[PDB]
Design a protein around this ligand. Structure first.
Ligand SMILES: N[C@@H]1[C@@H](O)[C@H](O[C@@H]2O[C@H](CO)[C@@H](O)[C@H](O)[C@H]2N)[C@@H](CO)O[C@H]1O
Ligand SMILES: N[C@@H]1[C@@H](O)[C@H](O[C@@H]2O[C@H](CO)[C@@H](O)[C@H](O)[C@H]2N)[C@@H](CO)O[C@H]1O
Ligand code: NA
Ligand code: NA
Ligand code: NA
Ligand SMILES: [Zn+2]
Ligand SMILES: [Zn+2]
Lengths: 404, 404
């Protein structure tokens, strides 16, 4: 039979000492999580208890959890005048993380690439792990932004600010004229998508109601009530209805088939530590353990973000319009069929089209009039719907494409 | 009909101002070259005439030449105590480029990843260029090393040194006990291969007889005499017989099918500039232009390294054992057949096995007894020949694999 739904438990801002305790709680019940890591904790400059950060990274990989890319230093270089070893402490003293969080999108996007270099430096064999998805799965700091398929995208238009924090008096978000930081974050999403990343936001956040609350670890919802929030998010387009306003994923395609019967849960392992943020270990590690227990007894199953878009499999039946990933690339089924080993999705497959959320011109993509592609550094408008092929390059096809 | 052979003209250490004059000569005669670029010239710290480096990079891409990865700063960080903007000038003052050229293989390999970040900084849309192969084609500084297929590899065992330069008295190369710098460069080769790179060395070097001659540009071999060198290299396992000793590709499999009827030429654009190395532009640009003409008159065709391993193409006939690349991955044909659009190589194809030069455990690879794979940070010996599949991971198949 079918589960009540699939929960994707995701943890942000590790690897830190508290990651080990969270992972041990997950391992007690065989639950796998997705960990969006910032490698500056491996360098010891992240202003957390992080001397065991490498142990935490190895533990996550060794016990089956998925490691994803959250950028090297959580955009904290944009929080200070000059980024250095004390920048995390100074941004924590001001609490200005959300202010000017994105500035130069090209440089900001490159800190996701920097993240992978540092991962490999501390763990040279990391790409021999099948659950290392640092190059293919990402999540933008502070931003409930999504890049899943060509027709499944969303952006947090109030995620970050140019001046006032979202919990401060006088804060106003204008959806028609978003902050400069939000507009830069959108460009970061598009740059990552063009490098083959998918980015995932969240439906529910196990966190303080807002990040201005003092001692945030103490105000986490109890496990039973949180399962109630998970229930309420199932098939309800929660990314658009979530509060507060800086957590919303604007433009999220409500009812899109890939999100059916799924809830992505966000939390942070630094909320599960007894320390500067409260009694997180004493209070919240038992909450996490109880939540896993009652969710599984209620009929939920837990899975990792790498399976959010199902991996193509020999012998599976696919309807027209079904989405899969094959070798990390998103494809959509052209015709209903049963997959066989020789009919894997490809750039010349007649059974699939590439449906990556990228915008570079790509082979075997079902383009629509109004789409904009980039090719040889030039942007082109699609005039006529068609499936791209090798000889229909934008620069030679004036009927299909118009250079901007 | 078939040509006498295929010449791959490859240029190292650009982009510099002289790259433009070289490209213009190539374009005048309809020839495409492969350029192994170091992006520190874009940052203006490469100690060359490079104020037009970005113009050179754009010209290479805009006129159809292939751009490949030669690392950010040509391993010059290993030539000085502290790498900075003057490091290129300092290493030029000592000429110690080959001494300790490789030290920390993990960091040295990561300068190939840094190279891409810098390329994307100066040219944010570079990934929209089909002839941009920075993420898939590489060449190690100073090193005639090859990573082509699972069964086509080679290493320059005398390429770099721990103390004495290869032309100095007292220099001894022990093929059984290579230098620490050479052993690091071998690991760099393996790191790049596990990231999906191929690395290409060279058959013949249009260069001074050895580095160390004072004016390296004015003495470049005349075009007719250099065509003779190409004639001698054709099908003669030139990478193993080439001089001097630091240019040899030891372990190069003589007679390997992918190298049949091909000659890879190495040269440097800085040899084609009127400047500190002599009158390279006045004297060597006509040599290059004449060489292109007489080589074609002799029956040679020119191609780029992205076609060295032929790209899989619908309608092409393939014999069993034929090698192709498909979406950047090397495959070997299982059985003779004509390629169809729905029958492309893949990780589950019955017509092809993966033949990448990588050593991580990989799907659809024809493993032999005695092979060693890396999986989940552990190394495994292959006990029994078999074609890998998703269900046969090393940690679950104690008959097929034995952990070391
Ligand atoms: N999802 C973010 C959340 O990460 C963030 O929490 C901060 O993260 C910083 C980086 O790890 C850390 O230095 C700081 O102490 C945390 N409070 C909050 C608040 O900025 O915003 C959420 O959107
Ligand atoms: N193939 C190398 C060749 O690149 C190298 O030439 C030096 O390259 C440096 C990097 O651009 C440059 O700064 C220096 O001026 C060049 N002499 C020679 C000698 O090191 O070795 C060849 O193997
Ligand atoms: Na992808
Ligand atoms: Na997937
Ligand atoms: Na490759
Ligand atoms: Zn975060
Ligand atoms: Zn070089």
């Amino acid at each position: 039979t079918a589960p009540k739904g699939t929960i994707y438990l995701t943890f942000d801002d590790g690897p830190i000492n508290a990651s080990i305790d969270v992972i041990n709680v997950l391992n007690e019940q065989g639950v796998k999580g997705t960990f969006y890591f910032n490698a500056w904790h491996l360098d010891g400059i992240g202003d957390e208890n992080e001397d065991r950060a490498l142990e935490a990274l190895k533990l996550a990989l060794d016990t089956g959890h998925v490691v994803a890319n959250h950028s090297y230093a959580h955009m904290v270089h944009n929080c200070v005048d000059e980024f250095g070893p004390t920048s995390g402490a100074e941004c924590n003293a001001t609490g200005d993380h959300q202010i000017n969080a994105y500035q130069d999108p090209v440089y900001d996007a490159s800190t996701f690439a920097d993240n992978l270099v540092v991962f490999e430096r501390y763990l040279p064999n990391i790409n021999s792990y099948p659950n290392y998805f640092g190059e293919e799965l990402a999540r933008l700091p502070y931003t409930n932004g999504w890049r899943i398929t060509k027709d499944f995208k969303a952006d947090g238009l109030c995620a970050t600010s140019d001046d006032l924090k979202p919990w401060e008096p006088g804060y106003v978000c204008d959806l028609d004229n978003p902050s400069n930081s939000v507009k830069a974050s959108i460009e970061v999403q598009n740059i990552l998508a063009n490098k083959g990343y998918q980015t995932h936001g969240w439906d529910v956040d196990w966190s303080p109601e807002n990040w201005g609350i003092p001692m945030p670890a103490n105000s986490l919802t109890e496990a039973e009530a949180f399962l109630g929030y998970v229930d309420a998010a199932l098939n309800s387009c929660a990314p658009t209805t979530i509060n507060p306003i800086n957590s919303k994923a604007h433009g999220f395609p409500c009812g899109t088939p890939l999100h059916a019967d799924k809830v992505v849960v966000l939390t942070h392992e630094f909320l599960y530590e007894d320390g500067k943020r409260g009694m997180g270990a004493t209070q919240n590690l038992p909450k996490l353990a109880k939540f896993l227990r009652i969710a599984k007894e209620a009929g939920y199953v837990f899975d990792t973000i790498d399976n959010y878009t199902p991996v193509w499999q020999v012998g599976n039946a696919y309807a027209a319009g079904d989405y899969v990933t094959h070798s990390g690339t998103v494809y959509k089924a052209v015709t209903a069929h049963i997959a066989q080993q020789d009919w894997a999705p490809s750039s010349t497959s007649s059974l699939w089209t590439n449906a990556d959320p990228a915008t570079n011109w790509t082979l075997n993509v079902s383009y629509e009039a109004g789409d904009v592609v980039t090719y040889q550094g030039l942007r082109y408008l699609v005039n006529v719907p068609h499936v791209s092929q090798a000889d229909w390059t934008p620069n030679t096809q004036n009927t299909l494409f118009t250079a901007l």
